[PDB]
Amino acid sequence: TTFVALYDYESRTETDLSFKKGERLQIVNNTEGNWWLAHSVTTGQTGYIPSNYVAPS
Amino acid sequence: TTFVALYDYESRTETDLSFKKGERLQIVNNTEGNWWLAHSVTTGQTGYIPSNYVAPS
């Protein structure tokens, strides 16, 4: 499966991809899973996590 | 819904969350969508993208 960018995006970190509207992108298989923005109830810290590292309670 | 961390994770960028195995985490609503590792066919560059910025071809 190929995706098309709907908008321009500028990278904020060393790991995200900059792209322009119209680019064709393919999903890369990755053991970490998709990444989600999460809040730790335990510590109060907040940021992105790799989905394959967690499980529902 | 709450998730539990299955492993320790150390942050690599300014935006990911470090956590220890056993922490309780909640998903933050986010306009960007989940993030996926992608390869640009157009440019050859590779990195994470916000899913809500793309659509299937």
Residue numbers in the entry:
A (entry chain A), B (entry chain B): 84 to 140
What does the report in the manuscript say about this coordinate set?
A number of these mutations are located in the SH3 domain, which plays a critical role in enzyme function by facilitating the interaction with partner proteins and providing the formation of the closed inactive conformation of the kinase. Here, the crystal structures of three SH3-domain mutants of v-Src were determined to unveil the effects of these oncogenic mutations in this regulatory domain.
The crystals of v-Src SH3 W95R-I96T (c-Src SH3 D117N-L124V) belonged to space group P65, with unit-cell parameters similar to those obtained for crystals of the c-Src SH3-domain intertwined dimers. Comparison of this dimer with those previously reported did not show significant differences. Both mutations, Asp117Asn and Leu124Val, do not produce significant changes in the backbone of the protein. As in the previous structures, a low-molecular-weight PEG is positioned in the dimer interface, where a cluster of interactions stabilize the domain-swapped form of the protein. Among the most relevant interactions are an inter-chain salt bridge between Arg95 and Glu115 and a cluster of hydrogen bonds where Thr96 partici­pates in intra-chain and inter-chain interactions. We obtained an intertwined structure of the v-Src SH3 W95R-I96T variant, which shows the same overall fold as previous domain-swapped dimers of c-Src SH3, and the mutated residues do not produce significant changes in the structure. Asn117 forms hydrogen bonds to Ser134 in the 310-helix which are not dependent on the pH, and might confer higher stability on this mutant in the acidic region. Our results show that a v-Src SH3 variant bearing mutations in the n-Src and distal loops, the v-Src SH3 W95R-I96T variant, shows reduced stability compared with the c-Src SH3 domain but is still able to form intertwined dimers.
